[PDB]
Amino acid sequence: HRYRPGTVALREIRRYQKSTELLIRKLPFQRLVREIAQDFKTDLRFQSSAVMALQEASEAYLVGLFEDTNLAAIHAKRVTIMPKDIQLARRIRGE
Amino acid sequence: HRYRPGTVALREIRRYQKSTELLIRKLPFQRLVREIAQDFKTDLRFQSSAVMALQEASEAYLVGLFEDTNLAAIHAKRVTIMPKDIQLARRIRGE
Amino acid sequence: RAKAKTRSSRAGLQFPVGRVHRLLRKGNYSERVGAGAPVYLAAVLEYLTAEILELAGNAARDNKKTRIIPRHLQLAIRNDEELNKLLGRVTIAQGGVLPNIQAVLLP
Amino acid sequence: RAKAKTRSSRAGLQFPVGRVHRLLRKGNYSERVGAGAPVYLAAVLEYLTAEILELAGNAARDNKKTRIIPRHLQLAIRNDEELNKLLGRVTIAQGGVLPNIQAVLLP
Amino acid sequence: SRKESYSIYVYKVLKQVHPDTGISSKAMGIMNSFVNDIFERIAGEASRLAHYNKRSTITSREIQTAVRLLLPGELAKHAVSEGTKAVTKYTSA
Amino acid sequence: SRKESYSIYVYKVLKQVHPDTGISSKAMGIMNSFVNDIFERIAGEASRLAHYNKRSTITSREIQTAVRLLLPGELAKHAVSEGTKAVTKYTSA
Amino acid sequence: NIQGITKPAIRRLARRGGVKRISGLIYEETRGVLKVFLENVIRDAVTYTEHAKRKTVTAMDVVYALKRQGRTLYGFGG
Amino acid sequence: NIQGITKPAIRRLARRGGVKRISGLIYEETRGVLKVFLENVIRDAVTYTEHAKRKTVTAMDVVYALKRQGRTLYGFGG
DNA sequence: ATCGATGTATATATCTGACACGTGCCTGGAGACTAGGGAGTAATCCCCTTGGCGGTTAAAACGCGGGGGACAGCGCGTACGTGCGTTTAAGCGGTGCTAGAGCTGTCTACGACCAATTGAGCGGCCTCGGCACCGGGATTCTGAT
DNA sequence: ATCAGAATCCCGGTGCCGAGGCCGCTCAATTGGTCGTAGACAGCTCTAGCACCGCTTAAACGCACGTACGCGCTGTCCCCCGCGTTTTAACCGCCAAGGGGATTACTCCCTAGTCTCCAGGCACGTGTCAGATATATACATCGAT
């Protein structure tokens, strides 16, 4: 049995739009945060809640951006999101 | 002699992008302002500078919106701006 | 002297009028604070809190739950146009999003 | 007493330190204002003013003009990425826009 | 070190509107953030209004105007009603 | 009725940077609005910092931090340099 | 009165915005958008006027309304 | 470390965003965007930390940075 | 190419009103001295951040087949740009008058401040019930026939 | 339409841990009184906003016509989805250490507050020169052949 392309994608949309857990891995995200912060100040410690706040904000921002990207793609009569779509969304948003 | 479609349009773009005067007629804009204000409070007076500030802000806002609409049009492989383009721009902008 | 009667009880409010007053006086907002300002502010805050909590409790009951969670709060805020406008630039932690699939993508 | 020496002259500044101090004390910002804060603020304001004015004068000279106009100010701000970012959500009255035509529209 | 919060009052309001409904700690934290945010917004707008009109006192009029400026539509309508009722009741002891 | 403005100082700075260049009344009004805006931004950020750190005094540290938070890149770098130089000169009379 | 914002005016605004070709439905869409914007700004300005117990909407009122809607305007006293 | 944000994670985020089909270049574009965002927020948070003479970035610092960038976060103490 | 039309830049001369300088005054800033309290500094304690080990399992990486969606090409028909004659009202200049913004004077209600009291609110401890995890049957829904 | 298979929903049982309640304490709100001042109200001035008339002319408007562009259809090929298999590293739990964040206590110096004075900055006035307008012109660009 093989589901036709799109079925599993829509099932995943429904599942993740129904769920609320964080989707980025904790350890990799933490490493990224520390690596980025290292360029500004050395020997920096981080509260667990600080890292959690960062993760929540980043995920929310990315979800919103993907929403606008989807809208741009659909506007161009496409169903696939592309870098040009991300670029348009960001440009219009003022970023 | 007839210039091909597009030449005069581009000339107008250059002229209006080089100039800074207000492009909406003063008397009609003032009438619109007063008509709108009537619904909030009656027998309202208006400073000349108040009307001028409103006109300046409105024109700037509309120019910015037309810029984003143009970008949307180009994104959709079109050269004509459409209501769907305005709608997309505004949605992405957060309005 | 007479028994201490709280300003909240005098105003028929559950929110702390005295605390709101202190926060206004020590919040670098103005030189002076009127006696009615904390009462008014407290009443407004209470109304908004009541509204949100009521809508969240309704969502919880619809989900066969007895405790309000961030998900329920997010649902309540996003399903009301006015509340959504008020809290437009706000991210609710652990709230998720509203189920929304564009019609053009459906099979 | 000794002849009055302005704080601006002591700091080698053109912006009014005394005025900035008064505006800080009466602006409901904090309970107390340090002695160095007005000096620092005035210096920063002066620097920013100098930057904008220099760029606007350059634009005026390029336009064979001897007086700075809102157009020149707008040009100066929008042609500098950093200044544009700082003044992103600001509308300069009678400033116009930057000449920009999309490449796809050209003949 | 004692750290004040609006938990108690939020709980009272919850018990008034939904006697059999509780609330999680996370949701309680959300409510605290919400209250603080709205407080800040209203107080700041009232402060601006006072400064604009060269007044040194933030009064119920300033609060009302801030509410009208910030809360959209019926939120504003009902908030204004509530504030006025509360002020009247307090003023009449 | 006297209405204070930054006209004199803006003009002074203009005559320092461009001795032969004048300025229109409209441009002067724009510059005044700019100065007021930046002042407000900086003072508000310094106030927030002070409140966050449970301090009652706005000092050069608060101003410096506000400048770093608001001015982007080299604007901040040079503004900080200018402020530090000015403070040093003032402190040494 | 909304019709006073004529088609040539909207075209001029679009030209300043760099628009080369314009659809016929754009004029009505633009009129609606402008009306909404104006309503919001005027509402706030009138609120300020009423709070000041004035009968004349001032430039300061307009400036404040624009500022609070994140559309700061330079040139009219702040 | 930027590679730790794997393709499946980005896909999950897109799914929550309602995206049905994803191009192969989206992962790199997204990584870049996320990096920029993070840099801005962390920069501001570190500035706050340094002003407080602290060596530990706090949740309050993060919250403040987000608030000042117009991305107010509820749930972490403000 | 090419030449003709044509709009647009450029060069010069008149005017005009708006900006740059001077003056008088007055009120806000500077010099001088005081108190007191806020912030700096030093010691302490404890909690909470960092680092390491191990297992184990769920998630990530990789390969592969294929189908459906992006994208390029083409035809058509219609909607919009360009130009021209007409008409409509916007603009400018003068004049009127009156509403209301703005300033001043006076005074009274109202909010800051201060000391004593006490009760509301917070930290800590305990328990039980809501929810979560597991497992298994029911229902839904999808795709190939 | 059918049917099988895969996924989700629901229903019930067990446990566990976090929300709710109770209790001691302590410090922050309340009460009662005093005093200065700020803003509420009356009244007067005089600015500027509104209303109108008339003339002019530039902008809007209606229409004709041609053509460039939006849009629908068709074909192709490539690259993303979906699924099976292997690998890897995330996560959970458990332990150890130490460093830095929060707290308290003492001191001192830095800023608010008051007074007295005086000079800088801000309305008012003026004159003169930069820029706006008009005209002629040169020049580059668009278009049809």
Author numbering:
A (entry chain E), B (entry chain A): 39 to 133
C (entry chain C), D (entry chain G): 11 to 117
E (entry chain D), F (entry chain H): 32 to 124
G (entry chain B), H (entry chain F): 25 to 102
Publication passage describing the model:
The H2A–H2B and H3–H4 heterodimers are formed by interactions between the histone-fold domains, and the histone octamer is established with two each of the H2A–H2B and H3–H4 dimers. The nucleosome core is composed of the histone octamer and approximately 150 bp of DNA, which is left-handedly wrapped around it in a symmetrical manner.
The transcription enhancement by the H3 N-terminal tail deletion prompted us to test the effects of H3 N-terminal tail acetylation in nucleosome transcription. Consistent with the structure of the all tail-less nucleosome, the overall structure of the nucleosome containing acetylated H3 was quite similar to that of the non-acetylated nucleosome. These results indicated that the acetylation of the H3 N-terminal tail enhances the RNAPII transcription on the nucleosome, probably by alleviating the RNAPII pausing at the SHL(–5) position. Therefore, the acetylation of the H3 N-terminal tail may reduce the nucleosomal DNA binding capability and directly up-regulate the nucleosome transcription elongation by RNAPII.
